[PDB]
A paper describes a structure:
The basic helix–loop–helix (bHLH) family of transcription factors recognizes DNA motifs known as E-boxes (CANNTG) and includes 108 members. We focused on two structurally and evolutionarily distinct bHLH members from the bHLH-LZ and bHLH-PAS clades, represented by the proliferation regulator MYC-MAX and the circadian TF CLOCK-BMAL1, respectively. Structural studies with engineered or native nucleosome sequences show that MYC-MAX or CLOCK-BMAL1 triggers the release of DNA from histones to gain access.
To dissect the molecular basis of CLOCK-BMAL1 binding throughout the nucleosome, we determined cryo-electron microscopy (cryo-EM) structures of CLOCK-BMAL1 bound to a solvent-exposed motif at SHL+5.8 (CLOCK-BMAL1-NCPSHL+5.8) with an overall resolution of 3.6 Å, and at a histone-facing E-box at SHL−6.2 (CLOCK-BMAL1-NCPSHL−6.2) at 3.8 Å. Readout of this histone-facing E-box required a larger amplitude of DNA release (up to 33°), with the BMAL1 bHLH domain (for example, BMAL1 Arg114) substituting for some of the nucleosomal DNA–histone contacts (for example, H2A Arg77). At SHL+5.8 versus SHL−6.2, the CLOCK-BMAL1 bHLH domains differ in orientation (around 90°) relative to one another. In contrast to the SHL+5.8 structure, histone interactions now involve both CLOCK and BMAL1 through a more extensive (around 1,700 Å2) interface with histones H2B and H3. This model, supported by rigid-body docking and XL-MS, highlights electrostatic interactions between BMAL1 residues Gln385 and histone H4 Glu52. Moreover, a conserved arginine (Arg173) within the BMAL1 PAS-A domain is positioned adjacent to the negatively charged H2A Asp72 and the dipole of the H2A α2-helix. Mutation of BMAL1 Arg173 and Gln385 to alanine, accordingly, resulted in diminished nucleosome binding in lanthanide chelate excite time-resolved fluorescence resonance energy transfer (LANCE TR-FRET) experiments (hereafter, TR-FRET), while not affecting free DNA binding. CLOCK-BMAL1 at the histone-facing E-box (SHL−6.2) differs from the solvent-facing E-box (SHL+5.8) in the extent of DNA release and the detailed histone contacts. The CLOCK and BMAL1 PAS-A/B domains cover the H2A–H2B acidic patch at SHL−6.2 more extensively than observed at SHL+5.8.
Author numbering:
A (entry chain M): 31 to 93
B (entry chain D), C (entry chain H): 35 to 124
D (entry chain C), E (entry chain G): 18 to 117
F (entry chain B), G (entry chain F): 23 to 101
H (entry chain N): 76 to 129
I (entry chain E), J (entry chain A): 45 to 133
Amino acid sequence: KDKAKRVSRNKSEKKRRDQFNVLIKELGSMLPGNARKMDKSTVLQKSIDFLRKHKETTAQSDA
Amino acid sequence: ESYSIYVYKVLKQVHPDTGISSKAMGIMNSFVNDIFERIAGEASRLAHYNKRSTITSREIQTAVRLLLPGELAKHAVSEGTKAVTKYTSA
Amino acid sequence: ESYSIYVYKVLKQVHPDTGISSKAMGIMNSFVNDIFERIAGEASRLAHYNKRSTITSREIQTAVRLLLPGELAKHAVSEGTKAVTKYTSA
Amino acid sequence: SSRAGLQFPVGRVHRLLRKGNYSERVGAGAPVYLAAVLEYLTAEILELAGNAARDNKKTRIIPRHLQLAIRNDEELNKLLGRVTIAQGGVLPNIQAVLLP
Amino acid sequence: SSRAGLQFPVGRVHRLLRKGNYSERVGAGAPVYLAAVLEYLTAEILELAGNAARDNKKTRIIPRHLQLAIRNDEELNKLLGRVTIAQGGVLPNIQAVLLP
Amino acid sequence: RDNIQGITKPAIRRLARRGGVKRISGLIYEETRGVLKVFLENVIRDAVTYTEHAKRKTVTAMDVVYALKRQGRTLYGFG
Amino acid sequence: RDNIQGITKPAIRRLARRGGVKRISGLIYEETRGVLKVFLENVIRDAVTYTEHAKRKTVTAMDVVYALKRQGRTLYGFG
Amino acid sequence: RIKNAREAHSQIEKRRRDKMNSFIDELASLVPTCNAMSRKLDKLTVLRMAVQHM
Amino acid sequence: TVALREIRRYQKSTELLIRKLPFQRLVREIAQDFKTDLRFQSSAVMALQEACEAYLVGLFEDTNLCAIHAKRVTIMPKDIQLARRIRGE
Amino acid sequence: TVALREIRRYQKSTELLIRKLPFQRLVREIAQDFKTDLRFQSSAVMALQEACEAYLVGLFEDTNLCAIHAKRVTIMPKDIQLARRIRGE
DNA sequence: TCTGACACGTGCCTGGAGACTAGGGAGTAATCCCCTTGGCGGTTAAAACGCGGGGGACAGCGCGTACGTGCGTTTAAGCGGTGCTAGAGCTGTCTACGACCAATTGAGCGGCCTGCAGCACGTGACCC
DNA sequence: GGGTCACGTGCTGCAGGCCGCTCAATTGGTCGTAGACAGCTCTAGCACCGCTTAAACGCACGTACGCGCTGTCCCCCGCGTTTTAACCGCCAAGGGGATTACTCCCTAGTCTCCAGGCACGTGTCAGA
């Protein structure tokens, strides 16, 4: 019967996964050159490249 | 023994959202020990100079005034004075 | 109380043909008190560090080694050791 | 402590005052007076150290913050002038004559 | 003092150690050891001071002689490096660069 | 008031000479007086504090000796 | 033997830079090593003396703290 | 035989996690706010800081 | 140009600029002159390292000031010696 | 030539180089700042004077050395300031 | 011949010395655990070495002012003498607080367990 | 069959709660000393007055030192390349320190007694 309690814990694990999924959509949509159908790894990869580019550009403007 | 409990409580009262490292805490404990020795030593010397066998708030107050710089001396004395008056009353 | 009697006697035993002025003697008395405090202070601290309630010749001998320079310490320590040896032997 | 209104202990302070051969006798006010003083000084340092932490976006105090907090305060700097702080670092002071 | 072969008082040293808040207890041999040390150090100064008096054709020691004896002797000079001596005067030190 | 001026230029010259000084700029006299005044003020404040603690009206030699001693300067001959 | 050479010229330069030194003569390195050697000897000798008095064979941070403390130098964080 | 397909699947799934985790650490390093952290940030926090930073 | 950058860099950071291993050996090298076959706690050595750098840095600061007083840029042993003598060494 | 003879004379002698009444008034001038209507022992005041002169002599010696380091004979406040700073004043 | 210091003589009290007893502290012994010390292998960064150029330091020359030195005039400090009070020092008396000892109670800390949250892993579903 | 996403399970860590133990705080009682208060006396310090000598202050003149300017050479600084040590990670053994228990000795406290030490006065000697 106590196995039912695990469902709440399963929901908690799902909540963490869902928070990640929501942030992936926001993270991808907040980038320039937006594209659909990017997978989670691709969204992160393009986010990494964007931030490197953004850092490079602001650094390029100085010194 | 340590003051980590009391230091943390004071830190929370001043900075409710700020934590403290173990290294910083060790430093604060050394600080407190240092201050104690300075005052206790001077209070004893004052009693010696004045041929007294006991320590009272007067010896502590004078030791505080001698040891601390202008602003700290004034404020530390005020805190000591109230605590004794308040404790004595209660 | 003063050490003028003992200081004078020692001088006579070293230099029989000279004496000590009043000002010079006041200085020598100030000196003796200063040296006593320095050694006794360190001996007390050694007892404190090692959580001991008794001061013995060991704490004093160590205090002498810590306070005095090499050559002077060797001679001062030798005299202290001999005095105890002679005393306990006599 | 409770009646004194202090966070810091008094009973151990009383113990420490009578211990160590400071005096033959200790008055009731002395442990209390001192406990208030120790708490006061502690609070002042913690306040400044916390500020140093905030200036660097930290929520946690480290030895570097304690060093900065003290040396920037002339009363504390004098009081602790002979004190070395582990991992405290140094102030970034450069003489003007050395600059181009 | 006679038993120890000392000129300095043993009882007085014991009393000072016993009643100076240095510790709860004092060992019987401690006063003897210390009295010998104090006597030795005193003798070192007196020997030099007596020589200083002689070098000035004096038969009596004055504060200046103590100053001369102390500051010429390195071990004593370090020991009394921060001591001020009444009517001690100063040593006649002049820098060569100032001379013609 | 103004007893620091009581230390005349000749007084400074004598002291400077005792310290082995051969030649003196005109600004030394004022700098020296400023420093001396501050030095003395610190010593007296401690001596007076001792007198006040004892609730005395008269400052004694021991108040001075204790003041100098706690400052690091041990004095022989005055107790 | 010869562990003082283990502190290399670049190490000396880094220390001098922390001290705000812009330009360093070639004689500094030897002078600096001599100065440090004296400092270490003084602190260690006292720390060892404390250890010996306690009849111990292992030197602890407190022996160092006592050695420094009596030399007018205290250290927070190490005890 | 076909049992290997499930074993391969669990290894593929871990490889996907490892690739994402590697990117999360790299992404965190590019956000200045992460410099204030001593401990490694959790997956959700790093993504949140990246969008907050942008 | 580089020296100013180095000063800023080293003043900003908190880590030791000396090497730890030769320091540990040096402590024994010296300590053995007082007593042989000694054992040491690592915390004792670390305490020494912090004190040693702080000591030398303070001397460097005074040395630099002495050179500046003489209107010079470089530091020399003569500047160190003046600072040391004034400080009682 | 005159300065060297004066140095030798003042180093040779032991008397106070400051007039007493000006000194006594200065002490009372200061002491009144802390508390009014004070009384002073003469020996206490003389103890202060001896310490004060000893202090200045030490200051002058270091000041002179600083001027010498700078390859100068004349002492300036600049030299005093360096010596005082090095000694922590 | 006089003044100050040293030596000699006299008187009184305190401290030191000697004697005795008990408890607590110090010293000694045995056992156990952790840290330090010692050794081996690999990788990366630091240190060491070499080369070229510029700036800094040192040396030399010239000029002017401030400082140093001497003389004369004016003033204060120092020395000696006179007068009075408050504070300091000493003695005696009385009380409250602290110390010492015993007895209780409450809160907090430390350790252990439980619950919740987080991280990693495996399986199923969906898409190609 | 491969890759991604979604769902559930297993294990670990942190926070909260509970249990057990200790200390401090609290409460109560007794005894003595030290501190506080009161009274009395004397000295040193403070205040005031007068005179003389030396020092300080003011004025004038000249020199040396310090400052400013110019020129030359060497060392240090900066960069690049090569070699070694430092640093990092992993593994093993022994000794010292730490912890616990037991025994013995010394000092402090208490008690008793005397001389020397300390202070004061006189006489002689050395220096003035």
